[PDB]
Amino acid sequence: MTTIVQPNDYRDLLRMFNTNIQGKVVLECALVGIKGIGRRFANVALKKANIDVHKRAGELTAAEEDALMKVLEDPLSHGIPAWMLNRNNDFESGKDMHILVNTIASTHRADLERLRKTRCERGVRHHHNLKVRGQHTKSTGRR
């Protein structure tokens, strides 16, 4: 920091994971714009990358952009714990992974597919649009 004038390579709008990001917000908060990332995950991701966290996102050079990317598709091997992941024990792999924008839709949409054929109580209520938890519905949530 102490950066007044814009870097010659300062990029005003950034595109990643098919998502576009601004170049005036701080880095750790900008990355929150993606699906599968938050504040807690991000810092633990940048920091492993020897990246600074209080730098405006547009001034992120190209070399950092990749290493940041590398530690994001390869989290575990880079050290980060298994309790900081959005997917801990996959149903098929049995693994611990962290999935992103292209995947959230499929892993979720595929989950309900498994519940309809399995006929669980939960799956049916996902169909008529009720509440899966045990919330009372007599007098609340009236469309």
Added chain:
Amino acid sequence: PEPINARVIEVLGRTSSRGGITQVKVEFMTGEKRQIIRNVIGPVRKDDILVLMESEREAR
């Protein structure tokens, strides 16, 4: 045109329904010693000074 000010000599108690307004007997310390009457809203006590935008008006 130039509002003057008058001093309170006494008080004649609440009159208006729901309280509030109070009749008063004032005089002009402008030097004419004109003892008259007026109505006032808000707590007021003896020696208080009022600002009268009227050199002349009467109530009762």
Added chain:
Amino acid sequence: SVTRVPADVFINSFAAHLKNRGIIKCPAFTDYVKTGVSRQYAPRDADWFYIKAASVIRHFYISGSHSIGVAGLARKYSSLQKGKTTPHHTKRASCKVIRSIVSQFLGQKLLIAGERGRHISPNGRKMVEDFAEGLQK
């Protein structure tokens, strides 16, 4: 003495001294923790460990001969939980960090155990007073 100076100056000065003297070292787990269930995100500063250590040793000095346990230190670093469409409530901090700090200090003999908990040792008092007078001016 030590209480004739505000804590803010003493804490930071001592933490800098400590980091310079290698007396204690940040372990690995100091870089993904949130410091307490109450807290919402992780700390911004990269050297909070040393600040916490300085504060803890100052707390051990204040109590003098009296004893302190770890869980009693966690209740001096509590906060307020929020974000639950429910009235707020108070929660205790985490004790793994505190345990690490006290264990490291004890390994340096600045901190002698007793029947319950631990209490300052005269060497620790010596050092704390020395730095207190060093910063006195």
Added chain:
Amino acid sequence: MSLEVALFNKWPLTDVKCQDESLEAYISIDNHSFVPHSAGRWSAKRFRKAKCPVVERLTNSLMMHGRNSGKKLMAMKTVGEAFELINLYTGKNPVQVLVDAVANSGPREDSCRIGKGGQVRRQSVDVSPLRRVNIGIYNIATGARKAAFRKVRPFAECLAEEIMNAAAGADKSYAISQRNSVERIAVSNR
């Protein structure tokens, strides 16, 4: 005297007064402590608040909003900031400005419901000094409060601008506009 109570340990209360006579005595300017925080049980009698230091009266209204209830320290800090700003724009003592403003606000006439007054029959009446000072204070504080909601700038700057404008009598300020509106509408009913 033996001690001068430099407010916030900067500005004195010596060469300070009020021009207007109607409310000259309903404004305490000499019994100010170094800090406007007195545990005085004011509002106990009917006319004891006329002795409350004016600044404490002012701060006790800056925390009128429900969220900010019971917060006097922030109010004192705010007031100090505003006083420095006033000194920096004007070069004179902010207390003078504050008293002049409280005098230049406050209606001198208002409409009420006298006798039966059926069918919205509202006569005109004059006003007592105490209500004048109260309304002046309330208007200053509310005007600064209305400007700083969902706006970038802080509460202190709005406060100081309002205060200086009112001391100038400019219609631009909120309090002066309110006073003029009330006075006029009451004249209509006179």
Added chain:
Amino acid sequence: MHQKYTIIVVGKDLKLVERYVKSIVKEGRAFGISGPCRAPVRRLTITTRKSPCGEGTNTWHRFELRMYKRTFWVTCGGNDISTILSKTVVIPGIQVTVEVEEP
């Protein structure tokens, strides 16, 4: 011979507990016993609905039980096993004021 003894007293009324005390202390001046240590009052509290059913305005009862405690343990060496009974008999036994003894 010497045993270091304690006397406990419990009660719900303040008058008898203040009357037992005077008698016992007057009786023990010789044996070396000394005054009491008036202990913190134990406050039992119960709030109950004033009605057997939910009806009308919601009105509450507020019952309580105070228990008073005076503790003389100043006999000790001044009183031997047998001599303790000397002190627990001349006093005016009251129908409700349990007094327990324990070295």
Added chain:
Amino acid sequence: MAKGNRRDLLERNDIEVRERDKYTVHTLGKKKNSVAVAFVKAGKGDILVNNVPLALVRPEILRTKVSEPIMILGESLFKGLDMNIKVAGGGHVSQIYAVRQAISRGVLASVKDEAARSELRAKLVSYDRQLVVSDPRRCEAKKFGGRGARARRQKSYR
């Protein structure tokens, strides 16, 4: 954590006993649930709260509120003697006022010519009366009608 009525406080068993006998004087101040105990003696102008000097207290804003009696009374007297207050009870501001009351009474208890004491009492009470006389009002209990002492649960007629 400290009640204000504990025997350890009104006696100040914190101090070592040999020195304890020097602090001839004792004093008390209070406000609400807050107590102040001043053991006073001869000195060269020093003061302490809970092992803390008077300047380095937490009300950076009300430091002058604490110091008032010194300035209104002058300096030579307080320079004459020394203190070590201890306080225990609810809140910060309550403790501030308790402390200043205790200081005023203790310093005013030191003089020996009651005429001087009266003159000083008159000088002081003129500035404020609560530096010498305790504040009586105290928290009021609540009732089962609602969730406050005087406010009631909102009533719906329909």
Added chain:
Amino acid sequence: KVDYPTLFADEAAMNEALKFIKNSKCITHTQICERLRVSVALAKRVMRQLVKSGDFAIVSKSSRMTIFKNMTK
């Protein structure tokens, strides 16, 4: 609605951001934000640079608010 940047381009850190305030007598982060239509952080940085130069002096400091005076005149 209103967009403000947080990072000058070269010459705007001189033509106005500095040349235009030096004339002023008393200034503040939010004032200079509303004036130059730039977010506050940049104002903090620039004011730090200026006190480094020595043209302005602090009169009242605090996390909520700190203000300056123009000694240079």
Added chain:
RNA sequence: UCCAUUGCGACAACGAGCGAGACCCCGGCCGCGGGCGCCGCGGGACGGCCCGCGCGAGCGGGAGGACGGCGGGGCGAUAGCAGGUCUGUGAUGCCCUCAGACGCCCUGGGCCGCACGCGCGCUACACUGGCGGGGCCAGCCGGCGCCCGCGAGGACGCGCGGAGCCCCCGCCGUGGCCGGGACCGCGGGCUGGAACGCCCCCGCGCACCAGGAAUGUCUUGUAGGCGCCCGCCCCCACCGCG
């Protein structure tokens, strides 16, 4: 005249009583005693003093005093309601159930089901703010050490113990944005015979920009804001008494 059938002064009325006040608990100031732990007995304030008025009862002001004129609670007259309660009871009259039982015991399920109308509440709409670090004080009252685990929790072993707001340093900088955290998807644990119950972590991130006709409560430690203990309870408080 009085908050008060509270009092003065008269009257074919005289003389009494209940209710009201008096009374009991709590707190504020002082004294004595005693003491593991602040807890036992008493004093003190009474429209007493000054000034005005008024036959008077009593009204207005000013003093000194811890407190100044019903400080907060409890008790609560005669008469009555087709008010509620037979689902609190070895409280109960008259009917109906009474050996394929409305008796008693076991296994599952429900009382929580949802296009919809409203009553008491909770959270928010942000700069008088959110986040991170640090310092620091309550009372009804009250249990802690060591080691693992991010945390929630767990294994051992002993009798010992208090928070939020707030203040200070910094980041954000008017963007439905780091405001707000509903909804939903993996996972780790506790309770219990048994999760449908409750906690923790990562991720997703609904409305909501101060709310129309209408309407509620409130005069000093009061409103409002902030949190903390008990009740029921195998786990669970946005509830209630404090």
